[PDB]
Ligand binder design. Structure first.
Ligand SMILES: CNc1ccccc1C(=O)O[C@@H]1[C@H](O)[C@@H](n2cnc3c(N)ncnc32)O[C@H]1COP(=O)(O)OP(=O)(O)OP(=O)(O)O
Length: 508
């Protein structure tokens, strides 16, 4: 449970025990082909057998030669990193900074120093995070940014319940801060004599003749034979039984929730893949518009609280795509009617033939749809008023009567003062009775328009921007000089003052 036996000490004989937490970070050292990765594999499997996946999280950085590739199958492993996975390692650095910062807040909120205290008092436990790193030499030379973070994890992490394990072929070159934080040190055979001398550490010879100066030996070193991770007579038999060992851990920890992999944005994102894999909420009155940039989770429009939405931007392709993302997501719901007013370019002609979609082009056809829409909304208004006057609980949600517009300029041309005022009144009257409006156009069109219809649209506080925040005077948002360019399938989701970057999926 606590004392993990990792090897047989040379002197009957007793096992060398590694105390949980107390013995701190582990530092595996030695020349090539002397059991650095086996010691790594023995440690990680030993801890996995005692603690749950929910209690113990691994993040294996295998930069050696795929020696820790079997450990990828473990339920304890959150993610597995290689030298080629640079973008994944960069995100991990961001993840740990946020995770450590969040930990420090929770510790300070409940007035505690160590993780052992926090988990004891708090009912919701935090997982122990071991950062396994095979081959430190390659990190030392080729990855100085990651090296800086590894020193921070070893120093500050242990108190927050974030331990660190690493193998290294050349100790001469490792910084004293990193070396000192490595509490436990497993030292395998070395070829060079100079490499051994540095691992001896402080001795009574280091003590100068000064009253008060002294060496404090906590515990003596021990010559130990490290156990193999599984029984076997050769490398293949051990590797086979190591696989069989993990199959048991998978079976034993079946109901225990597994750790989340590091969230990553795909290079290409379609609507079909977005709806199937990522979108796993499928709630009524929620239109998923795209994945968040940082967290990589579906962001959605709450139709009950925020019924209307603007699609602002210069890009014709960008706006039209966002309309299709909304139309596709609206079809998953059970709408009463959808009045699609397409622009002068007939881009959304494919949605015309589909069910529950009235394709609008001329002015006369728009008037017919407004009559059908208003007739339904008038009935809902009666049921709402009758419910309040009879002291009854009002209906929570209705089938959405949506009015999608691909072009604001086309809407103004196809309507007059009377018809524009009618639509504006419908928004004022029926916004709480399942009426929705999705307009698309340039930023200046909303601002320049002082007509009855456009005056109502400019007051809508929710929007999907497919343009820069600096290049619009509609929503007062935070921005800077060095703002990111608006590439295809990228925009901002504005709602209730706040905003966030999102990856908008392409509708084929
Ligand atoms: C990943 N290699 C193995 C995994 C399980 C069993 C054997 C091996 C193996 O390749 O054979 C060697 C010993 O049998 C096996 N071994 C360890 N302890 C042993 C022990 N107590 N008895 C017998 N063999 C042992 O270690 C191996 C040499 O060191 P290793 O490759 O583990 O690490 P490294 O090369 O020092 O560093 P890196 O992999 O990062 O380059």
């Amino acid at each position: 449970a606590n004392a993990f036996p990792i090897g047989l000490k040379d002197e009957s004989q007793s096992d060398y025990f590694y105390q949980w937490l107390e013995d701190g970070n582990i530092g595996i050292f030695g020349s090539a082909g002397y059991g650095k990765s086996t010691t790594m594999m023995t440690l990680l499997l030993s801890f996995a057998g005692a603690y749950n996946p929910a209690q113990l999280h691994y993040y294996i950085f295998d930069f050696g030669n795929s020696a820790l590739l079997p450990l990828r199958q473990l339920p304890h492993t959150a993610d597995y990193f290689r030298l080629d996975d640079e973008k994944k390692i960069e995100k991990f650095i961001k993840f740990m900074k946020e995770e450590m910062e969040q930990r420090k807040q929770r510790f300070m909120e409940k007035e505690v120093s160590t993780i052992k205290l926090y988990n004891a008092l708090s009912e919701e436990k935090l997982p122990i995070i071991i950062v396994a790193l095979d081959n430190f030499d390659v990190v030392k030379e080729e990855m100085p940014d990651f090296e800086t973070q590894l020193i921070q994890y070893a120093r500050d992490g242990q108190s927050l319940g974030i331990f660190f394990i690493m193998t290294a072929t050349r100790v001469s070159g490792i910084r004293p801060p990193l070396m000192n934080n490595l509490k436990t040190k497993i030292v395998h055979y070395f070829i060079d004599s100079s490499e051994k001398f540095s691992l001896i550490g402080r001795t009574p010879y280091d003590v100068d003749p000064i009253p008060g100066r002294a060496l404090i030996k906590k515990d003596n070193a021990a010559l130990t034979q490290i156990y193999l991770p599984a029984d076997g007579e050769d490398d293949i038999e051990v590797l086979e039984n190591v696989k069989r060992e993990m199959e048991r851990l998978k079976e034993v920890y079946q109901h225990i929730p597994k750790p989340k992999p590091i969230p990553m944005l795909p290079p290409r994102l379609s609507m079909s893949v977005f709806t199937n894999t990522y979108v796993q909420h499928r709630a009524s009155g929620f239109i998923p518009v795209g994945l968040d940039e940082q967290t990589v989770r579906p962001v959605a429009i709450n139709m009950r609280t925020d019924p209307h939405c603007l699609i602002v931007g210069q890009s014709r392709k960008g706006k039209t795509n966002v309309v299709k993302v909304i139309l596709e997501s609206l079809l998953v719901q059970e709408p009463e009617s959808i009045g699609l007013l397409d622009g002068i370019d007939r881009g959304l002609a494919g949605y015309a033939n589909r069910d529950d979609i009235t394709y609008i082009e001329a002015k006369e056809r728009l008037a017919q749809w407004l009559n059908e829409a208003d007739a339904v909304l008038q009935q809902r208004e009666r049921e709402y008023i009758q419910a309040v006057n009879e002291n009854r609980a009002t209906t929570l949600a209705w089938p959405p009567v949506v009015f999608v517009v691909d072009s604001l300029l086309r809407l103004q041309q196809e309507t007059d003062s009377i018809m524009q005022g009618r639509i504006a009144n419908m928004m004022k009257q029926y916004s709480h009775l399942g009426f929705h409006v999705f307009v698309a156009g340039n930023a200046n069109e909303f601002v320049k328009g002082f007509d009855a219809l456009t005056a109502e649209l400019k007051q809508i506080r929710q929007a999907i921007l497919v343009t820069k925040k600096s290049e619009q005077s509609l929503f007062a948002l935070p921005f800077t000089r060095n703002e990111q360019e608006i590439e295809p399938g990228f925009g901002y989701f504005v709602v209730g003052g706040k905003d966030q970057k999102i990856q908008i999926p392409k509708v084929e």
